[PDB]
Coordinates of C-alpha atoms in Angstrom, one line a residue:
Chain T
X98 CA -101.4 -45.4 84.4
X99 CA -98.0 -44.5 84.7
X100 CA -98.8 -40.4 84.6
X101 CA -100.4 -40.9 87.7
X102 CA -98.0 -41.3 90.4
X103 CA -96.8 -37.8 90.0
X104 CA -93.6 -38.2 92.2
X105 CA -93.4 -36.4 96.2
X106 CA -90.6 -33.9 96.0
X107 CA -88.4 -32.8 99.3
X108 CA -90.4 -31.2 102.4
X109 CA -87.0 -29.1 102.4
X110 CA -84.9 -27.9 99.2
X111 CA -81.5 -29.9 100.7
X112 CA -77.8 -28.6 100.0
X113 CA -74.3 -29.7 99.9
X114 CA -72.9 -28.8 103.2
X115 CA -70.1 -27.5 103.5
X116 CA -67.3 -26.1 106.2
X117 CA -69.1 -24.0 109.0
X118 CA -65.7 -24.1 110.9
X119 CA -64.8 -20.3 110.5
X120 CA -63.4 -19.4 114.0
X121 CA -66.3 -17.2 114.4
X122 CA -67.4 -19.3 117.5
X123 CA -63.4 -19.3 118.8
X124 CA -62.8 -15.5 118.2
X125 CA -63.7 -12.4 120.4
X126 CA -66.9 -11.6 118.4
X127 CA -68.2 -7.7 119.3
X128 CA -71.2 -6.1 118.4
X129 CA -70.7 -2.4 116.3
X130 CA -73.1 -0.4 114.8
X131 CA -69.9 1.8 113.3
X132 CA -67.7 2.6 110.8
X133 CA -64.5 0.5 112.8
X134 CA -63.4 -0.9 116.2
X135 CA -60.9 0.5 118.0
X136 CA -59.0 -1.9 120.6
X137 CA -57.3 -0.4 123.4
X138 CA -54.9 -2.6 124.5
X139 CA -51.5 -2.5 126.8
X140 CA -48.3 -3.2 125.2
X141 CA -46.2 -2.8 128.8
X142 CA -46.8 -3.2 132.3
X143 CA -46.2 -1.3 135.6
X144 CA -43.4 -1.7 137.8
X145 CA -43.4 -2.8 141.8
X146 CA -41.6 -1.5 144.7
X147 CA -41.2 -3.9 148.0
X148 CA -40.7 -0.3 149.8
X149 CA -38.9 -0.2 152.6
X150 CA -39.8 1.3 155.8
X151 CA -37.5 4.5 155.2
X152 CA -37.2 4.6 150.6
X153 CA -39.6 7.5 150.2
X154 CA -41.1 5.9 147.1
X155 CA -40.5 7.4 144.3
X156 CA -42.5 7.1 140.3
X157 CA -43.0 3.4 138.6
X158 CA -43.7 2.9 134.9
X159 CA -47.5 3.2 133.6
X160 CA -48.3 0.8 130.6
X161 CA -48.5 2.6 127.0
X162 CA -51.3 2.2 125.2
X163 CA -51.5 0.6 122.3
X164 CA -55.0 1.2 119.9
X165 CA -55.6 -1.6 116.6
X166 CA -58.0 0.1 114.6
X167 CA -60.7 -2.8 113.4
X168 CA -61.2 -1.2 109.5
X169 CA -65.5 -3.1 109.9
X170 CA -65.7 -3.5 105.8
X171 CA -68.7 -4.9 104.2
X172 CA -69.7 -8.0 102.3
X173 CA -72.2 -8.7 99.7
X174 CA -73.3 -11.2 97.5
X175 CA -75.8 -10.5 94.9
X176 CA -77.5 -13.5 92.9
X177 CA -80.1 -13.1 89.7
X178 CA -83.3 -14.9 90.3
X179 CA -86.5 -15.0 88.1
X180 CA -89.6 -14.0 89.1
X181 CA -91.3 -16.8 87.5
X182 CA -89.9 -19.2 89.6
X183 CA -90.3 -16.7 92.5
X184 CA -93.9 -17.8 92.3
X185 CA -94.5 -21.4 91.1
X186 CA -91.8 -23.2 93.6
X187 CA -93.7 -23.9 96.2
X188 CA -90.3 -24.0 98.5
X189 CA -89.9 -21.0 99.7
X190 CA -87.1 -19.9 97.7
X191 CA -86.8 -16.2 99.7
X192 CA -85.9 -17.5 102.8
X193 CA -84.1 -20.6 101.1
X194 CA -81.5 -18.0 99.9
X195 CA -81.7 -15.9 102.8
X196 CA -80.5 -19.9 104.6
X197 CA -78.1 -19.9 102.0
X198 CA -75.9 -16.6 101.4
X199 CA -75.8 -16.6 105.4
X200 CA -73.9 -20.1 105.0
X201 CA -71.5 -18.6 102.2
X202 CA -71.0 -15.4 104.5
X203 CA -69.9 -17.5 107.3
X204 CA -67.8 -19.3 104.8
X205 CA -66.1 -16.3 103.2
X206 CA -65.1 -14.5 106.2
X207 CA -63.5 -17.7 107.6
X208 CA -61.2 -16.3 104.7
X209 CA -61.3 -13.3 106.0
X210 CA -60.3 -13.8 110.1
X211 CA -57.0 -16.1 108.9
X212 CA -56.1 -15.5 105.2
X213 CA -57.5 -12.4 104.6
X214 CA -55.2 -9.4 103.5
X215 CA -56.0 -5.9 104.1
X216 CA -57.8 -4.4 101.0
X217 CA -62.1 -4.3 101.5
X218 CA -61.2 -7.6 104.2
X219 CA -60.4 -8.2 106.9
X220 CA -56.8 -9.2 107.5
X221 CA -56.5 -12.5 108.9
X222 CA -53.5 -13.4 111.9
X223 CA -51.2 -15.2 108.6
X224 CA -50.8 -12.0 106.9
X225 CA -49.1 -9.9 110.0
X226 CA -45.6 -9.6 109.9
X227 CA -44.4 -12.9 111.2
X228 CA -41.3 -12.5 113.6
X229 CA -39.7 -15.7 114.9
X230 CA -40.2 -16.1 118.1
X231 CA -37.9 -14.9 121.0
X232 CA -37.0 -11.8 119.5
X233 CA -41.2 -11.3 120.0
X234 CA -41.9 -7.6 119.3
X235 CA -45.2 -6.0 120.0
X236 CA -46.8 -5.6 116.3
X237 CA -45.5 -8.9 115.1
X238 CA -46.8 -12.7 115.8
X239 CA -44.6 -14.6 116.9
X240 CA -43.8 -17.8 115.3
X241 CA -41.0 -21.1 115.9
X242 CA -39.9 -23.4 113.3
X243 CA -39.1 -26.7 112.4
X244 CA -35.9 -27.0 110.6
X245 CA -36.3 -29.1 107.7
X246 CA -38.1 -27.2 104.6
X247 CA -40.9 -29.0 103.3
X248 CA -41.4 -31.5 106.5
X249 CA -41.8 -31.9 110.5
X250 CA -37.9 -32.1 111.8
X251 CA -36.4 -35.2 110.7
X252 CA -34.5 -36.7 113.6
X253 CA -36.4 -35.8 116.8
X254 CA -40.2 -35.5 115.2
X255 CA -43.3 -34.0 116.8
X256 CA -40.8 -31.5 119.6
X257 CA -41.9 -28.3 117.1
X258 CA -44.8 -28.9 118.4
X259 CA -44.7 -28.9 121.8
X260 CA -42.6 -26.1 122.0
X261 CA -44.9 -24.2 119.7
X262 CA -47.0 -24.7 122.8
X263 CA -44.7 -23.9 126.0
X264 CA -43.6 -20.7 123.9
X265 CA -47.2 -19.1 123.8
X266 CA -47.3 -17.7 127.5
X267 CA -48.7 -19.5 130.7
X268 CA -51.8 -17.1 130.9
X269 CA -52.4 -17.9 127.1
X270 CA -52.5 -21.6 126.9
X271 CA -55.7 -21.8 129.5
X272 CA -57.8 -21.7 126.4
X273 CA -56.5 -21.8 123.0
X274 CA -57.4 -23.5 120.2
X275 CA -54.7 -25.3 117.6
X276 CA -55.5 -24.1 114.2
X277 CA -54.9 -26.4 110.6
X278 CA -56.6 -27.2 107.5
X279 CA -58.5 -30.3 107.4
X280 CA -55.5 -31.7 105.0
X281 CA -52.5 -30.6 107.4
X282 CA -54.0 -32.5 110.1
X283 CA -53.7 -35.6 108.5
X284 CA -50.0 -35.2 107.9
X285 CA -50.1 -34.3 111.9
X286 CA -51.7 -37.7 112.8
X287 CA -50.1 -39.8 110.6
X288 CA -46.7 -38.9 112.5
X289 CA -45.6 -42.2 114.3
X290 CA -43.0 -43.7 116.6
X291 CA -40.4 -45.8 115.5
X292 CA -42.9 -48.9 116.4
X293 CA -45.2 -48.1 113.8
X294 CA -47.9 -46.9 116.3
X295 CA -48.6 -43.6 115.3
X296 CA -48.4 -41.1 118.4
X297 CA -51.2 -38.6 119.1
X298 CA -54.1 -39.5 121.0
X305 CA -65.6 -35.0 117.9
X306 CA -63.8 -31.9 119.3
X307 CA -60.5 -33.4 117.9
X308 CA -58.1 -32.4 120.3
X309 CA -54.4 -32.5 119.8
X310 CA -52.6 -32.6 123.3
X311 CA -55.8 -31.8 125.1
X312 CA -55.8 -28.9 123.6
X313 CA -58.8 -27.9 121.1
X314 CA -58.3 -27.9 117.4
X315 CA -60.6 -26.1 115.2
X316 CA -60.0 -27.3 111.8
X317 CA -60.1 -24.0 109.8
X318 CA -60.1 -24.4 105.5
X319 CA -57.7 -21.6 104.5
X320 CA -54.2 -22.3 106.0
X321 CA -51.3 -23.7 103.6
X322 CA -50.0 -26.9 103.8
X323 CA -46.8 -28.2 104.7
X324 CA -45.1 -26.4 101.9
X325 CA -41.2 -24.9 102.0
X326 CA -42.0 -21.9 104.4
X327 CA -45.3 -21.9 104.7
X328 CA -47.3 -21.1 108.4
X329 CA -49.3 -24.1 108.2
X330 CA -50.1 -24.7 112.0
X331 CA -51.4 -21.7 114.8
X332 CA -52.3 -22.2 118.2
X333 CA -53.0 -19.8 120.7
X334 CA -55.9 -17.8 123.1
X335 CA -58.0 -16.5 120.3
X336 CA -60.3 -15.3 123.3
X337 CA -58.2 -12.4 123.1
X338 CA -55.2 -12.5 120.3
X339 CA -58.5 -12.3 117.0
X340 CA -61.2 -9.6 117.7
X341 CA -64.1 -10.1 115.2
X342 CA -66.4 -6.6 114.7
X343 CA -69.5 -6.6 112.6
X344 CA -73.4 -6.0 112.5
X345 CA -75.4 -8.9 113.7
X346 CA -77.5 -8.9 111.0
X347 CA -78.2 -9.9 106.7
X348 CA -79.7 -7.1 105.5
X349 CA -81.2 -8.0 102.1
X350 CA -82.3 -5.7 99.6
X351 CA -84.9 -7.7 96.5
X352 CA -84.1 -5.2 93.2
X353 CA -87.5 -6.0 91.2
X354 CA -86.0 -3.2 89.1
X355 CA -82.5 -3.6 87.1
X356 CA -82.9 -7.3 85.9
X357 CA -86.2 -6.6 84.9
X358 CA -87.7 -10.2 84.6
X359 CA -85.8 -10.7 87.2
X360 CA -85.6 -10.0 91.4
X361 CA -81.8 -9.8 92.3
X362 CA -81.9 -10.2 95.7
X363 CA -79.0 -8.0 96.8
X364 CA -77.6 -9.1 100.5
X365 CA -75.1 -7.6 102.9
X366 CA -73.7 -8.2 106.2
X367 CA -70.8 -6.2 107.5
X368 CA -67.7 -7.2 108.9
X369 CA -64.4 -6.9 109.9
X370 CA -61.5 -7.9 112.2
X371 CA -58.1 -8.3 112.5
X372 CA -55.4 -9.4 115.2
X373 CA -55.7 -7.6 118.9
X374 CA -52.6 -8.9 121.1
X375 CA -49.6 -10.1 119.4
X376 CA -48.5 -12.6 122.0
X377 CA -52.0 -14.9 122.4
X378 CA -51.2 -16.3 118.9
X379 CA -48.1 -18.4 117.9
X380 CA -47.3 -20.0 114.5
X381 CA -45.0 -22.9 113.0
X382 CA -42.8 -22.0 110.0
X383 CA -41.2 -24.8 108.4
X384 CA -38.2 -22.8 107.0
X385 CA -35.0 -23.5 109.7
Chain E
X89 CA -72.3 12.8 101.2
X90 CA -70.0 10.9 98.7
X91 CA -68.1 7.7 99.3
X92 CA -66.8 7.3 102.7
X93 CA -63.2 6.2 101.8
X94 CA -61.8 9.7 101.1
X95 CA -61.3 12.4 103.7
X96 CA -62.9 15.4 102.4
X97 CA -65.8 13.5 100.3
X98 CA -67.3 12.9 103.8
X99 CA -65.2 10.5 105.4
X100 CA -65.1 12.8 108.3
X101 CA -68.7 11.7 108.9
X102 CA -67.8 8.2 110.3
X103 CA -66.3 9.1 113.8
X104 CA -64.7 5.4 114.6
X105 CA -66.5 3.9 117.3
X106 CA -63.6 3.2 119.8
X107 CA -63.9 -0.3 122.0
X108 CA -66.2 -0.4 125.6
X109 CA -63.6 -1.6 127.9
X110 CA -60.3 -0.9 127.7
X111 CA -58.4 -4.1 127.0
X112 CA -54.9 -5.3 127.5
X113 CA -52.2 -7.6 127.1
X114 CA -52.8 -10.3 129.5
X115 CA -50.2 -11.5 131.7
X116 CA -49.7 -14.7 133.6
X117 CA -52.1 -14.9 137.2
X118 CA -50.4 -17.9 138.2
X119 CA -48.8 -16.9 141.3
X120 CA -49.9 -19.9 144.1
X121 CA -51.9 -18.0 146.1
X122 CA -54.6 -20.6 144.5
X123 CA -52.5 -23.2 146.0
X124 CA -51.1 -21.8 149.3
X125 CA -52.8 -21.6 152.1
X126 CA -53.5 -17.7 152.0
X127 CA -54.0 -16.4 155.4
X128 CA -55.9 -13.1 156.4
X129 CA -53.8 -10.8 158.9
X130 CA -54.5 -7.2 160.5
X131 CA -51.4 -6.7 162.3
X132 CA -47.3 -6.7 161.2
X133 CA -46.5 -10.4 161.2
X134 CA -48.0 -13.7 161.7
X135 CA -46.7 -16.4 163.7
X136 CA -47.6 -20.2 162.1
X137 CA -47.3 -22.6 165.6
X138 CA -45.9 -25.9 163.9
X139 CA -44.6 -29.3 165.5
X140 CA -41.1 -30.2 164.4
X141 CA -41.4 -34.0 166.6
X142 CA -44.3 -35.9 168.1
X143 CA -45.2 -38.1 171.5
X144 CA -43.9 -41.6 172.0
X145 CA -47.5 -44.3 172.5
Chain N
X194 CA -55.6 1.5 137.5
X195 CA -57.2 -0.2 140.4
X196 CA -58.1 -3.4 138.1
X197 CA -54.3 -3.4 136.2
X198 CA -52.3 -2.7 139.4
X199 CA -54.2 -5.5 141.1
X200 CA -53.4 -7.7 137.9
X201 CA -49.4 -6.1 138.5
X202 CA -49.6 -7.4 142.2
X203 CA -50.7 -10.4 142.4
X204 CA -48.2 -10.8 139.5
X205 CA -45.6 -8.8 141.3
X206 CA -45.7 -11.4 144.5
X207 CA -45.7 -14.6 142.4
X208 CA -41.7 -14.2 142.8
X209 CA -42.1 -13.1 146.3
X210 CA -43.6 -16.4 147.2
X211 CA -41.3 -18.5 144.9
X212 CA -38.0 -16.7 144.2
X213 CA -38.1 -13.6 147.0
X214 CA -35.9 -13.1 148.8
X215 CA -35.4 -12.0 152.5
X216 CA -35.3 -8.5 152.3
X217 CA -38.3 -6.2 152.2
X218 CA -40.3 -8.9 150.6
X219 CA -41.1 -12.5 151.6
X220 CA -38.8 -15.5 150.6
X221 CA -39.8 -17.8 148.4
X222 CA -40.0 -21.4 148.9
X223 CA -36.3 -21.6 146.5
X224 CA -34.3 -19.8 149.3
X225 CA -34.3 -21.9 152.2
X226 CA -31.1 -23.6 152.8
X227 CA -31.7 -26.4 150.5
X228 CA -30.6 -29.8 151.9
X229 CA -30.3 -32.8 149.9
X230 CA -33.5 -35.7 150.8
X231 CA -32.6 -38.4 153.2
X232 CA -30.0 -36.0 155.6
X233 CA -33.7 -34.3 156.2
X234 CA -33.3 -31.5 158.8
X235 CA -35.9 -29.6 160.0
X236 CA -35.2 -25.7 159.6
X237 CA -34.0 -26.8 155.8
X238 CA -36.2 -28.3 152.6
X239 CA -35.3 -31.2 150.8
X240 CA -33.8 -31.9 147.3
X241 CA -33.3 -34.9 145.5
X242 CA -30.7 -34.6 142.9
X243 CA -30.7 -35.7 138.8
X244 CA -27.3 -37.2 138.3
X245 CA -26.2 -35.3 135.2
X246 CA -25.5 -31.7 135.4
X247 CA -27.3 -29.9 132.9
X248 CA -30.0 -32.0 131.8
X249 CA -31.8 -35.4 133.5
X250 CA -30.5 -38.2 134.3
X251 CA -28.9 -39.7 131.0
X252 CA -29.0 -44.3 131.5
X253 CA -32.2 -44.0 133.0
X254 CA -33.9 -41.0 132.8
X255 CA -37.1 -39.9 134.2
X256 CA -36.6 -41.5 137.6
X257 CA -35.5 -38.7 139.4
X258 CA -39.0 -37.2 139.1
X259 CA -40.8 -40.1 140.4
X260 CA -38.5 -40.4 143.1
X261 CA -38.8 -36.6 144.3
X262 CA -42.7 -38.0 144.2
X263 CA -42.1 -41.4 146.6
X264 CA -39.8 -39.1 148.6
X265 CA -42.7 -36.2 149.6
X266 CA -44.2 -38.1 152.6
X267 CA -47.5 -40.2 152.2
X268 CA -49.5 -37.7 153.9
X269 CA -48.0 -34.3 152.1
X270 CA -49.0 -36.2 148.6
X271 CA -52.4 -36.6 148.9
X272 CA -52.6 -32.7 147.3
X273 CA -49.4 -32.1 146.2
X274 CA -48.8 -30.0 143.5
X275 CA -45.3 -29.7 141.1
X276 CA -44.0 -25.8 140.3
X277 CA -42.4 -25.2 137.0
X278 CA -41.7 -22.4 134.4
X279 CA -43.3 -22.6 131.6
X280 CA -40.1 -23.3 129.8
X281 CA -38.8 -26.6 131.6
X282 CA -42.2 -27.8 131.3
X283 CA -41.5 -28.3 128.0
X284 CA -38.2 -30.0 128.3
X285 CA -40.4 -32.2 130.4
X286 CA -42.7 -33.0 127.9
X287 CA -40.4 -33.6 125.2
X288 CA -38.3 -36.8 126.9
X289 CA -39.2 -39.8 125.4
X290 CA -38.9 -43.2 124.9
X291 CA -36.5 -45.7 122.7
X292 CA -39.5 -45.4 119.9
X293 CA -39.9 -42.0 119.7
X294 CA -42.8 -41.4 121.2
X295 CA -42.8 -38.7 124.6
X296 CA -43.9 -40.4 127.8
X297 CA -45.9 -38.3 129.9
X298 CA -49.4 -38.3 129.4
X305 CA -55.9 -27.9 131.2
X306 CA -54.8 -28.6 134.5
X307 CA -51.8 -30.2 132.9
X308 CA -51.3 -32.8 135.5
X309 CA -48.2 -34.6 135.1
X310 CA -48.3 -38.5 136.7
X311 CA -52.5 -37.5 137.9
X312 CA -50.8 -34.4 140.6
X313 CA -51.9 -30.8 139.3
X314 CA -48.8 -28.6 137.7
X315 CA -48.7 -24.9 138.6
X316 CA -46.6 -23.3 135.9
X317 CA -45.6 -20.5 137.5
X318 CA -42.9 -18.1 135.7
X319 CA -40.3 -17.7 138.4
X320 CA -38.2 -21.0 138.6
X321 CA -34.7 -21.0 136.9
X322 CA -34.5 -23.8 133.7
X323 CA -32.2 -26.6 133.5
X324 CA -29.1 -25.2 134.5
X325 CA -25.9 -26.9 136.4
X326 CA -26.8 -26.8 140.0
X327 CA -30.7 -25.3 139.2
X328 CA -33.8 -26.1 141.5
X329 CA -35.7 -26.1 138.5
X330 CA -38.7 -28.4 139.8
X331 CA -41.0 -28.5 142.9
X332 CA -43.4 -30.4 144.0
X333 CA -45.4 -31.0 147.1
X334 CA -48.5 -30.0 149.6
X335 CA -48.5 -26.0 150.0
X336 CA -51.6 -25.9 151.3
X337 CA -49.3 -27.2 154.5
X338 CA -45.9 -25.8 153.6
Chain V
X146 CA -67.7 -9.6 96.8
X147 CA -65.6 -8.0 99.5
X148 CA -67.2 -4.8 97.4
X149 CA -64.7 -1.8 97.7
X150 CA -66.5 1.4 98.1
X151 CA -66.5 2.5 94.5
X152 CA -67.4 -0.8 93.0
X153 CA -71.0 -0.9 91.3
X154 CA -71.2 -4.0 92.6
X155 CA -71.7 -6.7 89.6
X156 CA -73.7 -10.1 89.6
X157 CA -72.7 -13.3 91.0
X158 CA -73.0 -16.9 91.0
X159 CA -76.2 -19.0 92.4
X160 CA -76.7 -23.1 93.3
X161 CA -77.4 -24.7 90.4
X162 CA -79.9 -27.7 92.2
X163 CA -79.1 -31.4 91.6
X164 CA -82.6 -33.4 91.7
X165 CA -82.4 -37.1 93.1
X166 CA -85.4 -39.2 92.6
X167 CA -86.0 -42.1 95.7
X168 CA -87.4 -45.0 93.6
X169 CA -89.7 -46.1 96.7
X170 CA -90.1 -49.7 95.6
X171 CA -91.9 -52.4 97.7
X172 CA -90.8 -55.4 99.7
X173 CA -92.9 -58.0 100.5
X174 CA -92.6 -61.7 101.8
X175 CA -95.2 -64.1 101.6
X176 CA -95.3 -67.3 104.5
X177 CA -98.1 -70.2 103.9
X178 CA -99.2 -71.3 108.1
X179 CA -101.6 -73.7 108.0
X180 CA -105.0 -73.1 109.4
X181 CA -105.3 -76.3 112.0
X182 CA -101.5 -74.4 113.6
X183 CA -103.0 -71.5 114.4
X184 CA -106.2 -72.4 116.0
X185 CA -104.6 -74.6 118.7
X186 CA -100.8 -73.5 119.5
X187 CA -101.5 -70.6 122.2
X188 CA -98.5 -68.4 121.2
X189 CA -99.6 -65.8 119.3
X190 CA -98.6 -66.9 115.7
X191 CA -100.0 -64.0 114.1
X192 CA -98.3 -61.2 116.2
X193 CA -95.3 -63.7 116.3
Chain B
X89 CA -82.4 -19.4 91.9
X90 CA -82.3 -18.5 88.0
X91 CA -84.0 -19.1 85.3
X92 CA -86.9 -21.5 84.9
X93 CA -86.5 -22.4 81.7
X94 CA -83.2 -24.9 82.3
X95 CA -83.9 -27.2 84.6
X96 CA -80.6 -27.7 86.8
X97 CA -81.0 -23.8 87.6
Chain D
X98 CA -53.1 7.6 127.1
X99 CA -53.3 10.2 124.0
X100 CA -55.4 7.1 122.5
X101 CA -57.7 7.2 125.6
X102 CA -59.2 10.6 125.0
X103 CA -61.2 11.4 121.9
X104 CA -63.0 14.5 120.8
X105 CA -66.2 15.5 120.9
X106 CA -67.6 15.1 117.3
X107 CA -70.3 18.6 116.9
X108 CA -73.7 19.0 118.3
X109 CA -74.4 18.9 114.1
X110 CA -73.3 20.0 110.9
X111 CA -72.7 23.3 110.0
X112 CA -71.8 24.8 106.8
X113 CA -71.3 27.9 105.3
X114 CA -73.5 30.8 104.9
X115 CA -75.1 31.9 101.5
X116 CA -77.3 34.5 100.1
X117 CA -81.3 34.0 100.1
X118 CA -82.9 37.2 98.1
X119 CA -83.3 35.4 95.2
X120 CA -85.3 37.8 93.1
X121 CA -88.6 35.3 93.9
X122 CA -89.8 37.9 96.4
X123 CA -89.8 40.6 93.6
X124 CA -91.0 39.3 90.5
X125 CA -94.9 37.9 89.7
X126 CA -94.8 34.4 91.2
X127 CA -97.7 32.4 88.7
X128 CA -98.2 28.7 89.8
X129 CA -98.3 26.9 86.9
X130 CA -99.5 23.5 86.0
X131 CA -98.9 22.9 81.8
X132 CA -95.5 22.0 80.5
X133 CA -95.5 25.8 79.5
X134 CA -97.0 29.3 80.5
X135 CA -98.0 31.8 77.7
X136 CA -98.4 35.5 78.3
X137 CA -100.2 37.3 75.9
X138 CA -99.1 40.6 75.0
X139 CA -99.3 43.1 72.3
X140 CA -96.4 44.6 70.5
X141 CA -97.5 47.7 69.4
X142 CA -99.8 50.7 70.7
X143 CA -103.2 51.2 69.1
X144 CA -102.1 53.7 67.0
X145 CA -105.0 56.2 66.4

């Protein structure tokens, strides 16, 4: 009577789970039903008189307009499934891939809006002509650096970065977010005075200021950017469709279904200043 | 009504849809008119009335 | 327009009430016949003073801020605020101790009173007023 | 796929699914109380 | 998923 | 502010222009519904 115990399976087909942190919820994300996204943004700024009572005031400056065109590619993932086990599984295995290309989508982009180059993707804020920062142009992120190569600076730690912080604008800073891999930010906290006692004190803020804990950056390497901060509010403009559109192909894998899936997106940087980076070069 | 990456193979079908508001670089608003004591005036001046000593008790 | 030369105004006057001058524009609270804290006139502000020229004070540093605090007035500090550019702020943040580790612990308050950063103020220089502090919703 | 616009797009990978069987055993433990305790020591030895 | 036939599919 | 204007895309597509007399309106029109349509005629006169 050992056949007779027939073992109770899962309620709900379970998963590893893995890193929703995709700066999705941190970014400017618009609504398009288009081809692109255009931002219209304002490199310069006017200029102000204090007239006096006899001047006869004459022109000011107007701010040029600067336009980022969002490119809005698409992104599809297309796996094989059998229609016999389509209909003998009693989890519901449609919407149980449905739950489950959504959470690689949300995990490719995350690619995408900070690694991501320019070909079919969107170009993430790491691959946009880094200039160090104080000679800040306009279509350039800014960026400090350390001094040593492959480390924080060696004889006064940790001041990289807090001026990485004082050196992203005062209007910036009201709400950024820091931005490392979950393995930089170890070598971050285990930074320590000469005591011992290392020195930084859910949301794991550095600073006070938010960190979101991205998966794509590089480590402390030679010259790597391995740390961003800045007002993503306004420096990362995500575009896309606010929908998975999936298309079931009963017809090319013929014993099979093929569900073909595709959700559109794309995004790239939007003002040059709200985002500041750490290179670890001199 | 081929691919829309080309020009002439109808990639002058896809019109890019340009932003709703016009945005801009955004520029420090600090300026301590949150912290001064900001003062509504119709007229050419104002005159604060302040007391530089005080009475003997 | 109307919404970016707003934005360019109220901008424009954050030097007027800090750094302006007299002429055609209002002065800011920097040019006022500074006058150095316990000779305290009336028709003058007070300063306290750092020691070293170009940076704080070097045996004992950080007391000159805490003294330009105990030196405000009971009264004025109850809500007080400091006024720096966003630059010294950080040359504020990064003194330290003998370990190592920087001292000072959104509204980055520095000792509990609220910091304006506004982006008028000159940096440490030789004889800069580089840090305020005190109750402008009186002064 | 980041699919390019000229692509045909291709196949893909899919979850292979790990099973984990819970054993479910039992646990029991088994205290001898003596009949004469229970009819005559007002606390509630059963519910105790 | 794939295939029935395999079980880890 | 070059950036801030765009053009108006069309009211539709146009395109151009081709001929229509297409030699249907002449000839005997026979709707068909066989893979193939089989006229029978005779070659030659009767020949008396």
């Amino acid at each position: 009577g050992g056949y007779l115990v027939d073992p109770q399976t899962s309620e709900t087909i379970r998963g590893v789970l893995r890193s929703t942190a995709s700066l999705r919820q941190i970014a400017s994300v618009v609504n398009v039903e288009a081809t692109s996204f255009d931002v219209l943004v304002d490199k310069t700024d006017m200029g102000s008189g204090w007239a006096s009572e006899t001047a006869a005031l004459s022109e000011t400056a107007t701010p040029q307009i600067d336009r980022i065109t969002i490119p809005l590619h698409e992104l599809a993932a297309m796996p094989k499934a059998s229609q016999r086990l389509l209909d003998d599984s009693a989890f519901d295995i449609e919407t149980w891939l449905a739950n489950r290309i959504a959470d690689k989508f949300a995990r490719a982009e995350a690619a995408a809006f900070i690694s991501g180059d320019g070909v079919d993707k969107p170009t993430g804020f790491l691959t946009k002509t880094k200039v160090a920062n104080g000679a800040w142009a306009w279509g350039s992120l800014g960026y400090v650096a350390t001094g040593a190569a492959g480390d924080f600076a060696a004889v006064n730690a940790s001041d990289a970065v807090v001026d990485l912080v004082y050196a992203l604008g005062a209007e910036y800073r009201a709400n950024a977010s820091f931005v490392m891999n979950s393995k930089t930010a170890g070598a971050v906290r285990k930074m320590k005075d000469a005591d011992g006692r290392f020195l930084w004190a859910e949301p794991a803020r550095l600073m006070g200021y938010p960190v979101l804990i991205a998966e794509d950056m590089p480590d402390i390497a030679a010259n790597a950017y391995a740390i961003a901060f800045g007002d993503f509010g306004n420096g990362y403009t995500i575009a896309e469709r606010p929908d998975l559109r999936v298309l079931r192909d009963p017809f090319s894998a013929k014993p099979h279904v093929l569900f073909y899936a595709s959700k559109r997106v794309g995004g790239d940087v939007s003002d040059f200043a709200a985002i500041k980076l750490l290179k670890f070069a001199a | 009504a081929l691919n829309s990456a080309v020009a002439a193979e109808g990639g002058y079908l896809v019109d890019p849809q340009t932003s709703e508001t016009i945005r801009g670089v955004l520029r420090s608003t600090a300026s301590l008119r949150q912290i001064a004591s900001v003062v509504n005036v119709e007229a050419t001046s104002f005159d604060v009335l302040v007391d530089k000593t005080d009475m003997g008790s």
